[PDB]
Amino acid sequence: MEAHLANETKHALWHNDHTKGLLHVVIPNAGLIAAGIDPALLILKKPGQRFKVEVQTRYHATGQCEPWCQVFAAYIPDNALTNLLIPKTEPFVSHVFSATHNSGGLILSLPVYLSPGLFFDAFNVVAIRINTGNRKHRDICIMYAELIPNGTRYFADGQRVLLLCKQLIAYIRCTPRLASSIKIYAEHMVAAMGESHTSNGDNIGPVSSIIDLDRQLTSGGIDDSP
């Protein structure tokens, strides 16, 4: 998340040539189990190989091709979701929150075309070059239909932040430290969110707040269309 953020300045400084719009795409590492290679040699081990990833287009009966794209990324093992969702607290790491066995993640750059004549179809396959063994490289090939599905999830993200904020408030309130000013202002802020929601209902209501992805990745595809 740091190398991509550092490299974003090149895309930010771009003013003309709007046919290449960089965006953040997260590719899960669930398919790496069938790769059959050593994950240790994929992030930082025996430097000198200089592994790189290239993105190229594939036209059909028109000619020419994209002049590749110099991009790179790195993986992150050991519950990457925990360290990408929960803020980094390495100096004071403790038993914070609760989650199951997570996985890693990766960021890949995929240019997009934006113009008054947008258009959309499925006739172009994006080729990804990986600097590994050519024997059973275990690559993927998708068309442009999956790249642009014309949808977004704006309503499902609201409840995800609520669970995290409730958990952090509970963690802060569970330790009896600091002064009573923090407690009283937190109580005032909680009461300010509703008259009958807290006085006649509940303040926090932990009930069964478990960090899981059940209703977040199932529904909410087309919900904010005009």
């Binding site: 740091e2 953020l5 550092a6 974003e8 300045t9």
Partner: protein, 298 residues
């Protein structure tokens, strides 16, 4: 320590001989350092080169390039003088308050061309050369006259009141030999002064004015910032940007370090080296015109 020797010019005149034997105090400057010098290099005819009078900037850079020396006692047998070398004690000297105004204790005396007033010109009757005694002050009015002259130079292409005293000055600028150096150094300073913190500072004018609304330290900047406020609203005023990393990034440290480096560079370039720190004893440190003091090395 080491002492230089200057040959006595012929046709000695008692009128100035008596003054030299009575005063023994004067600040002089030299370019060529030599233990055995007969005609040195202080010649107005030789320094006139083509014939045009020297410019103020030319004289300033010539004085900056040249070293400085303090005139010691003079004996009829031979002429002796003391130069400024390394930071070592130099006993057996004498100084006097040449400036008409008082000088504060621990002040580094510099050398400037006479521009404060029309000083007396002692026309020597000898054949070798003549010596003119300047009458200026080290830094007090220097820090203002340099600003005035650079402002005049940059605008081409007075009265100073202190404790009820008015001082008159006569400017002189007719050559462009130093204009190129002035524009080069000002453009270098401008290029070295621009940093990334200016955008953040300009993107905080509403918060700054809100904070200063109940502070009281507003007049001390708005009495002179007549155009800063006008130009504040004529800028981009961008929203809060996103840094490439939020772990080991701090443009504030970089910009303050750059400002410190540029300030040190300008202070070194505009600061004449003069290791002269006197220490008074018994009487007051303030000097008065018409008194005699000693030399103390620190």
């Amino acid at each position: 320590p080491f002492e230089i020797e200057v040959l006595l010019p012929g046709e000695l005149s008692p009128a100035e001989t008596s003054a030299l034997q009575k005063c023994e105090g004067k600040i002089i400057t030299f370019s060529t350092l030599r233990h055995r010098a007969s005609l040195v290099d202080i010649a107005l005819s030789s320094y006139y080169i083509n014939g045009a009078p020297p410019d103020t900037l030319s004289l300033l850079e010539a004085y900056r390039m040249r070293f400085a020396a303090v005139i010691t006692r003079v004996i009829p047998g031979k002429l002796l003088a003391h130069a400024i070398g390394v930071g070592t004690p130099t006993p057996g000297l004498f100084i006097q308050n040449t400036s008409p105004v008082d000088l504060c204790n621990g002040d580094y005396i510099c050398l400037l061309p006479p521009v404060f007033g029309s000083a007396d010109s002692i026309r020597l009757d000898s054949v070798g050369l003549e010596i003119v005694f300047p009458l200026t002050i080290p830094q007090t009015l220097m820090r203002e006259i340099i600003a005035k002259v650079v402002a005049r130079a940059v605008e081409r292409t007075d009265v100073i009141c202190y404790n009820g005293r008015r001082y008159e000055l006569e400017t002189n600028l007719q050559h462009r030999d130093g204009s190129d150096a002035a524009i080069r150094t000002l453009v270098l300073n401008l290029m070295f002064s621009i940093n990334e913190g200016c955008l953040l500072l300009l993107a905080l004018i509403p918060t700054l004015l809100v904070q200063g609304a109940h502070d009281g330290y507003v007049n001390l900047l708005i009495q002179t910032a007549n155009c800063v406020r006008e130009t504040g609203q004529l800028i981009n005023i961008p929203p809060m940007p996103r840094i490439q990393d939020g772990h080991r990034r701090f443009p504030i440290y970089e910009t303050i370090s750059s400002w410190i480096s540029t300030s040190s560079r300008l202070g070194d370039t505009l600061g004449t080296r003069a290791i002269l720190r006197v220490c008074v004893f018994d009487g007051p440190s303030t000097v008065h015109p018409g008194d005699r003091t000693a030399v103390i090395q620190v």
